């Protein structure tokens, strides 16, 4: 009357992990894996995305032609990285809808600039100022042309420029607001008159407003920046009597995967597809708690700092 | 578990079992041994790897989006941008919380299921030659040498060989 | 010692279908059903929604009274369908916040127009232009009144119109921007002066800007369109000295299920509740991959082109 | 399946069974036959139809919304409109992917469950007159004519009638 | 239920049972009695309370948001604000509908599971001294006084004491 | 040959509840619990949030200093409650981007006002009007200063005010639009001239527009309100020649959990963390069907009015 015994069973481990389920906020399993990326290496990887470090320059300063940003001329980028240390070091300016211009340029992803020979007859070109020095000599925004009188006269400008190309043209121009009446007349020999940049499909008119603003870099005047997009078959019509900061050409507009990010993280020679303002992070996990701002193939941001996915059975010690 | 095997009628796991997730322990005239079952172990592992493949390595490319930090007070438009992003983050945070809870509940249930399948598999093999003691162990009512235990472990145990011996030992007064 | 055998089992089929589960990206079941609608019949069904085919006319052109859009006067619609072939064939115009006016009119769902006898004493009415021909004779927007001098004089207009009704009134008006100084004076005998349309609850003032724009349909001038909503008990006050393109009445504003869609799909005599720019699609399925733009009872748009729902057990061939 | 019947101890399905989803095959002195079980078949079908009713035929009326295609560059406001719609589409796409995965896992589990219920139902009917062979088949230890098989199929089989005959054949040396 | 016990081989519930969710009814020479099983009852209750803790008492603080009712026609910007809020509400409404459906399906399955665990527990206790009648009731083949029924209810029933008596009554011609 | 019987079973109840599952829209369980809060107590609880009942005053009226809102000076709040009965009882005014000013003030959560001694030499201060009575005597907005000529002269104002503090300053100012030419000259002795409020980082210029608007409280003129935020180290520069409604100081700007709500529910002495325009509601449940507008720790709004969560097994009567 001999017998035997056969017991079925499962394994267990001495170091289990707590996970959540539908019915239990704390249940221990043999193994788990983290689904939330919570740490950053620290630095932004210069690959595989084309990074452009703005250094002391904002995107708009490089666009206009701030002398300290001349190295940026005609550069492309997948991601433009603006630094908090940045500062404008040229003629004081403001942009109505600054955020929108910054966005559409960042989304375009290029600063390619083609020069066009505008017919400025009867006017002086290449105006300069002591507040915008280039090579220690008085200069101006590299992509803008400060127009002034020639023989103490400033005639009505009615200039034309057609877009006979296959692509769109982005024109950046501005209006000068002299700080005093005497400056208006010594610059344009006339009382401030409105400017009008128009196309077959649009129309923008601006009034120069003379008056003193708080001085910045020893300048009580101001420049206001505007932009116009001219599509193929359309024409750019400038209609001014003074105070015009004219364009020297146009920028190309592209459509793609480019953008811009505010960050103070250093650029390194590594390879990572996901970029946050804190630096690049791995993207093996489906979620991340590092930063809501991301660029590239990134995990989705969530508020939890940890989420354990069970990869083993329940742990039952002896 | 919904089958009552793991943390159920199986009182606890075996830390000495390192070559598999499920297996057999036996006692006979030749001693006491342990061996892992490969099929049930591999069934649970493959299902869990299937979960991971869906969740790991698959991310989404986003490039130009909206601004999410602001240095100036703007009012209406800024309120909408903050609200949109806050709404988005809360919904994804909810998805992540529910996903892990559901996945973990299912993982615990499926590993309990594989334990029960092996138990059922073994019970049917033994037919009338063994009885379930209630704690995942079978009393086998015949001499069971190591080669006979091996035959049960890889599904070649022939119950007719020992049936006469087993029925006599089960139904003795 | 006779016996019998009883085997339990399940069916299987020779042509199974692959579906996804939580643990398996490819598992075959006996039958499944598609949950993503991915195909369009091609055409928009004129039922059960009241469709209005814009043909050569945009919504704004019908609103203003472009001669080729006179058949649209006082029409209603559930969905207004704009065509890409559309073009303006009247006086050149632009609308500040064009998108918003287009939206609120589309959401209102009607072009019902009531005429009101404005008291235009001391001025000539019914101004015409060769660029806006109706029946081969020079005309203008059917809902706008181009005012001009009478006996070489244009007095200050200070006209009143009260909303003693139970509903809101939508007023569409405009400002003329003559292309030259001589045109301003031969039209209004005065230098361009600002217009001011006001109510108890609002105030809009516009400055006419004389100057040449690129010619369109042989017209260097421009008209700028504005709108005002006057609620019950309120009053419309027009205060101009020239350059006024006045209203001949007001539009009714309604609240409902109306909207507008851009599409080039033909209208057909079928019945389908869901409309996309690609055409009407069935709405039996819960999701669709046809177009993110929809109107009516439609499936929700998703990026997947297929999602199989298992409607049978796992398939296990012999 | 979590019960180990379909694609488990049931080796494969029957393509020759076209009148139901589950059923019985038998062999006796009168031949070999096949018949479908209506209750288990109808239980699985009704549960699946219940899933379809929730998912099919129920859609949402939307009329005036936002613009989703743009012909001009506008900047900030346009970025928000694109972002809102992109955010929406991704969340609904996620819901659709998770829904189908969960529903399909549940459908496979519930059809495996109905197979197991029928197996359990039949096992209890036979009491001590039959033994489970391990592959979904029962060895019945008594003469079983066609009318006796029929009685098992619609739940009127009286085990006491054959118990004496069956116990003698089971416990013979 | 996926185990086929509740609304399955258990024909109906007991309204006379008010001291627990699961239990035992018996008949012996001393009469007919009813008693509740505490462990299975507490297992189901604790799982359901676990669901409630996750869902109850946990809400989200929101303060300054966007406007959601409008007294004037504004056009584009207003359309986006209405759309954002409508999009949000539909996604949360979907989450709430799916959550309750999934939770309720799981709650019905887990209470059916606890019924089956108790049935399995009891079946193994009785070993060869009882037979399953098919409707959740066991025929016990030996004299079973109230103290013997009590021993089965709290897991101290010694089957060897009655095995000889039971086998004789089961295998009598 | 004696035997016994042991039946296993489950409980049932005479009053079950219907719930939904994945496979069944109507299945009865022994017990359930409601997850959607659908009822409101009726009133807003004055605890634990600091409620500020606006009564007859809007937030802007309290900000400007409408006499009937003087009791609100320097008040804080977690939630500001505006009533539909509210009305302006002072000088008629309008705010460009009214919604944004209302929002940023509501989010700031305070009306703390510091007075600053602006140097208004050569001008008369404390202008009054019969439409804005305080204590039955003609007065004005308590936080605005209506400037007028002194000895029939109004010189060019070029005033300065620096923000040498550690926090931001919110300045509320306005522009007067006289209803007639004679009013402009008897007020400022000159033709209406533009105003210019500027900082190192911003610039706002406004043109007064003379002309009659529909009379409100017997006033054909109008005031337009503007605001400026001056950050530390920056300066406020006002540059006007008349028509200036100047500030008497600045408001503090804070960042926190404050907001505003439109409601006509009475305030009561109860304690409830969730506030809706319908009143406070319990927040034990995870969802609510009361109102999409909420403040505080609230359940999330859903369209369903009921959702039963099963808290018991399936109910199977005998
Ligand atoms: C309106 O008033 C402001 C000040 O109340 C005037 O701005 C100031 O113009 C003076 C020139 O007389 C500047 O003084 C100079 O300032 C520098 C400091 O950067 C100092 O080093 C010089 O020695 C000299 O004192 C002053 O800085 C400047 N401040 C500003 C612009 O904020 C303004 O000119 C007046 N407007 C008009 C149109 O008169
Ligand atoms: C500012 O300059 C532009 C061109 O540089 C002037 O616009 C042009 O005005 C002339 C009239 O002298 C138009 O010439 C005519 O054009 C048609 C072509 O459509 C042609 O068939 C006629 O025979 C004649 O040559 C020209 O088209 C027109 N172009 C525009 C408006 O784009 C404009 O008049 C100048 N502005 C002022 C205020 O003088
Ligand atoms: C432009 O025309 C409107 C009316 O067509 C003028 O507004 C009106 O001005 C008169 C003063 O002559 C006001 O009349 C007074 O009205 C009150 C009613 O509140 C009445 O009780 C008095 O006895 C007197 O009749 C009239 O109310 C007022 N209506 C408005 C402003 O809506 C306006 O003055 C004209 N504009 C110019 C610049 O002349
Ligand atoms: C816990 O489970 C995870 C997931 O299966 C295992 O993580 C893997 O570890 C192996 C090394 O054996 C790597 O090849 C994989 O790339 C890892 N994947 C992840 C997501 O981390 C992990 O090894 C398991 N841990 C233990 C201790 O068994
Ligand atoms: C746009 O250009 C036209 C033509 O160049 C300007 O019109 C001339 O303006 C001068 C100076 O104002 C006048 O003296 C002439 O009488 C005008 N000439 C013609 C041919 O009409 C016009 O002033 C410009 N507009 C703006 C806003 O600068
Ligand atoms: C990544 O950087 C962000 C800042 O952009 C950090 O998020 C902030 O953390 C700081 C404190 O270091 C707080 O002052 C902010 O209020 C936080 N903002 C948010 C949105 O959380 C974030 O903590 C950093 N993450 C890591 C991992 O370094
Ligand atoms: C696969 O399952 C679907 C869903 O149950 C069945 O689709 C139905 O087909 C019937 C015809 O028998 C129609 O009455 C229904 O309207 C169909 N519904 C849907 C959603 O398509 C389908 O018949 C099944 N296919 C097979 C081959 O069995
Ligand atoms: C609004 O209407 C008033 C009155 O009709 C205009 O004021 C008159 O304007 C004329 C011409 O400009 C002057 O000569 C008169 O002295 C004014 N009359 C009165 C009664 O004041 C006013 O100009 C109009 N405003 C606008 C912007 O057109
Ligand atoms: C329905 O029409 C839309 C266009 O409005 C199509 O979506 C586009 O497909 C074209 C190519 O035909 C691409 O150029 C676009 O980039 C697509 N846009 C999007 C958002 O996908 C769509 O493919 C059409 N669908 C069907 C079924 O015909
Ligand atoms: C139905 O189940 C709910 C949830 O478990 C029970 O609700 C609780 O009732 C008790 C009183 O016994 C309170 O202590 C809890 O605060 C309640 N919670 C909720 C969410 O309501 C309820 O008692 C059960 N009903 C019945 C009749 O058994
Ligand atoms: C801003 O202030 C300056 C100086 O106070 C004003 O310029 C003076 O204006 C008066 C009256 O217009 C002129 O007569 C003087 O010739 C100017 N003085 C100086 C020192 O230039 C200027 O007008 C003001 N600007 C505005 C828009 O009001
Ligand atoms: C809470 O108040 C809101 C109003 O702000 C109510 O929602 C409205 O109900 C009214 C009828 O009383 C309708 O005219 C509106 O169209 C409704 N709006 C929405 C968004 O539903 C709501 O019914 C009130 N709720 C309770 C419980 O009193
Ligand atoms: C940026 O500016 C700082 C001083 O403001 C200067 O020291 C540094 O060299 C500048 N960097 C570049 C790249 O111009
Ligand atoms: C530039 O434009 C003027 C118009 O005033 C014209 O007279 C002149 O010829 C143009 N110059 C050239 C080089 O075409
Ligand atoms: C202005 O400068 C450019 C290059 O910087 C030169 O080509 C052009 O001739 C200059 N114009 C004048 C008027 O000096
Ligand atoms: C099972 O194991 C035995 C050893 O005990 C071996 O002899 C037999 O071949 C195995 N069965 C196989 C490989 O199918
Ligand atoms: C639309 O315009 C085209 C030419 O542009 C013309 O041939 C066609 O007849 C027009 N259709 C209508 C309905 O006016
Ligand atoms: C029209 O308005 C003028 C105001 O200038 C008034 O004199 C005239 O009587 C009005 N005409 C009618 C018909 O009321
Ligand atoms: C203008 O035309 C309308 C109809 O088109 C007519 O009733 C009105 O009398 C006309 N006015 C003049 C001044 O001719
Ligand atoms: C079950 O089937 C048999 C035929 O084998 C039939 O006689 C009997 O009535 C059936 N039971 C029913 C209908 O309840
Ligand atoms: C089980 O119940 C019996 C009463 O029938 C009691 O004597 C015994 O001690 C109980 N077992 C325990 C408490 O472990
Ligand atoms: C609000 O205004 C009404 C009349 O409009 C007045 O009766 C009531 O007393 C006012 N309440 C307060 C608090 O001023
Ligand atoms: C006020 O400003 C004027 C500038 O016009 C100046 O002359 C005067 O001294 C200032 N007053 C005081 C008290 O500083
Ligand atoms: C204006 O009123 C304030 C207090 O209301 C007072 O301090 C100031 O002196 C007054 N100014 C004049 C010019 O009366």
UniProtKB/TrEMBL annotation, chains A, C, F:
This protein's record includes keyword Transmembrane: yes
Chief place where the protein resides: host cell
Keywords, alphabetical: Clathrin- and caveolin-independent endocytosis of virus by host, Clathrin-mediated endocytosis of virus by host, Disulfide bond, Fusion of virus membrane with host endosomal membrane, Fusion of virus membrane with host membrane, Glycoprotein, Hemagglutinin, Host cell membrane, Host membrane, Host-virus interaction, Lipoprotein, Membrane, Palmitate, Transmembrane, Viral attachment to host cell, Viral envelope protein, Viral penetration into host cytoplasm, Virion, Virus endocytosis by host, Virus entry into host cell
Pfam families: Hemagglutinin
Superkingdom: Viruses
MF GO annotations: host cell surface receptor binding
Topology in the lipid bilayer: Single-pass type I membrane protein
InterPro entries: Capsid_hemagglutn, Hemagglutn_HA1_a/b_dom_sf, Hemagglutn_influenz_A, Hemagglutn_influenz_A/B
One GO term describing the cellular component: virion membrane
Keyword Endoplasmic reticulum: no
Coiled-coil ranges (or none): none
GO BP term, example: fusion of virus membrane with host plasma membrane
Subcellular location: Host apical cell membrane; Virion membrane
Family: Belongs to the influenza viruses hemagglutinin family.
Self-association state and partner proteins as the record states: Homotrimer of disulfide-linked HA1-HA2.
Function (record text): Binds to sialic acid-containing receptors on the cell surface, bringing about the attachment of the virus particle to the cell. This attachment induces virion internalization of about two third of the virus particles through clathrin-dependent endocytosis and about one third through a clathrin- and caveolin-independent pathway. Plays a major role in the determination of host range restriction and virulence. Class I viral fusion protein.
Name recorded for this polypeptide: Hemagglutinin
Organism, as annotated: Influenza A virus
Lineage start: Viruses, Riboviria, Orthornavirae, Negarnaviricota, Polyploviricotina
TrEMBL record, chains B, D, E:
Free-text description of this protein's post-translational modifications in UniProt: Palmitoylated. In natural infection, inactive HA is matured into HA1 and HA2 outside the cell by one or more trypsin-like, arginine-specific endoprotease secreted by the bronchial epithelial cells. One identified protease that may be involved in this process is secreted in lungs by club cells.
Residue pairs linked by disulfide bridges in the UniProt entry: 144-148
Coiled-coil intervals, chain numbering: none
Subcellular location(s) per record: Host apical cell membrane; Virion membrane
Organism domain of life: Viruses
Function field: Binds to sialic acid-containing receptors on the cell surface, bringing about the attachment of the virus particle to the cell. This attachment induces virion internalization either through clathrin-dependent endocytosis or through clathrin- and caveolin-independent pathway. Plays a major role in the determination of host range restriction and virulence. Class I viral fusion protein. Responsible for penetration of the virus into the cell cytoplasm by mediating the fusion of the membrane of the endocytosed virus particle with the endosomal membrane.
Family: Belongs to the influenza viruses hemagglutinin family.
Summary of subunit composition and partner proteins: Homotrimer of disulfide-linked HA1-HA2.
Name of the protein this chain belongs to: Hemagglutinin
Native source organism of the sequence: Influenza A virus (A/New York/933/2006(H3N2))
